[PDB]
């Protein structure tokens, strides 16, 4: 019954989750699991950025919106669109066009 | 290979292009095709709002179409709502 | 040196950054600040509506503030409507 | 009268119309207007898209959002957002803080 948008959407919900409910709020990241996700399941999109311990925090910092050290789900879906983003203008690196192709996206 | 959290957000670009890349500008959505779009990706908790609504709001530059970014409004949208959704009720 | 049109660009950001560097998260301009960002940077047709109003579109993740991206939808917003006013009379 | 904020917009107008003016419709961008709108004041920001003229026509179809050869104003202004964006992602390319810190922008400086 779900479509393909849902099904992703509930894909990024369920991810959340996994994480979220470990320690402390089962409903917001801290920055444990917030780093175990990311290490994890953006292995891929985010691998340089991995590989920077001090990047990660800031990338959590930077979504952290109410400065509460935790990462709400309102908050984490920000990192959800700018990746979705950033692997649209991958596929699109140094296109010459015409019209409409897409090469690989971020992580390949 | 990648992750399925990575698989779906790739599949979130599949999912607009199967409606920008109908006609004219390839990311373009217009009003037609984001009736379509919502009828049939969204729940009847987003279609309520009407394709109307949504398409002014979301066509920020009022040029007449949705592009990627402002389709990631709809998106951040659909996310919040669902995950408020999954603790109800 | 950059041009006058880059320079803009970046005074856009620097714009934001008087406001989101208020308090709080580096970008986020909160409903507070938010006021002020209007009361100072824009013309009154654009105030005039209301700044809690203007928050609300704004806060597409509604988690209390508005990013730099969030603020991107008001500059562009500004700027159509300014761009339309230039050619009245 | 005019705040920082307005007059950045009102430079983008302005720049927008002394190219919009020149060839057709005088009031939208021909795929010349642009293109020597961007080899001129995008010099920097894009410089090195500038070196591939095919890579700017892909840049102008794109925006081109109604795909009548022409840009209005309303679709140029999702370039100057996104350059505003990409410059200050550039500020921050590999910032590991503490707390707030700019580096160098688009095009340097
Ligand atoms: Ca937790
Ligand atoms: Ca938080
Ligand atoms: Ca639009
Ligand atoms: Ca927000
Ligand atoms: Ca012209
Ligand atoms: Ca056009
Ligand atoms: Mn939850
Ligand atoms: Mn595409
Ligand atoms: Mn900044």
Redesign the interface.
């Known amino acids: 019954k779900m479509?393909?948008?849902?099904?992703?959407?509930?894909?990024?919900?369920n991810?959340?989750?996994q994480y979220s409910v470990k320690l402390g709020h089962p409903?917001t990241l801290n920055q444990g699991e917030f780093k175990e996700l990311v290490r994890?399941?953006?292995?891929?999109?985010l691998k340089k950025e991995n590989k920077?311990e001090?990047?990660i925090?800031?990338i959590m910092?930077?979504l952290?919106?109410?400065?509460d050290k935790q990462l709400?789900?309102?908050?984490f879906?920000?990192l959800?669109?700018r990746?979705?983003?950033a692997?649209?203008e991958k596929?699109?690196e140094?296109?010459?066009?015409?019209?409409?192709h897409?090469k690989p996206?971020?992580?390949? | 290979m990648?992750?399925?959290?990575?698989?779906?957000?790739?599949?979130?670009?599949?999912?607009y292009?199967k409606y920008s890349?109908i006609k004219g500008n390839?990311?373009a959505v217009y009003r037609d095709d984001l009736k379509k779009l919502l009828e049939?990706?969204?729940?009847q908790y987003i279609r309520k709002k009407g394709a109307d609504v949504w398409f002014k709001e979301l066509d920020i530059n009022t040029d007449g179409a949705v592009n990627?970014?402002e389709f990631?409004i709809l998106?951040?949208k659909?996310?919040?709502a669902?995950?408020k959704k999954?603790?109800e009720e």
């Open positions: 479509s393909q948008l849902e099904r992703n959407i509930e894909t990024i919900i991810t959340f989750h409903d994890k399941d953006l292995q891929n999109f920077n001090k990047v925090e800031h910092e930077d952290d919106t109410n400065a709400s789900f309102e908050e879906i920000m959800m669109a990746l979705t983003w692997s649209h596929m699109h140094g296109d010459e066009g015409p019209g409409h897409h996206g971020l992580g390949e | 990648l992750t399925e959290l990575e698989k779906a957000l790739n599949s979130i670009i599949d999912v292009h890349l390839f990311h049939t990706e969204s729940p990627f970014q990631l998106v951040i659909m996310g919040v669902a995950h999954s603790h």
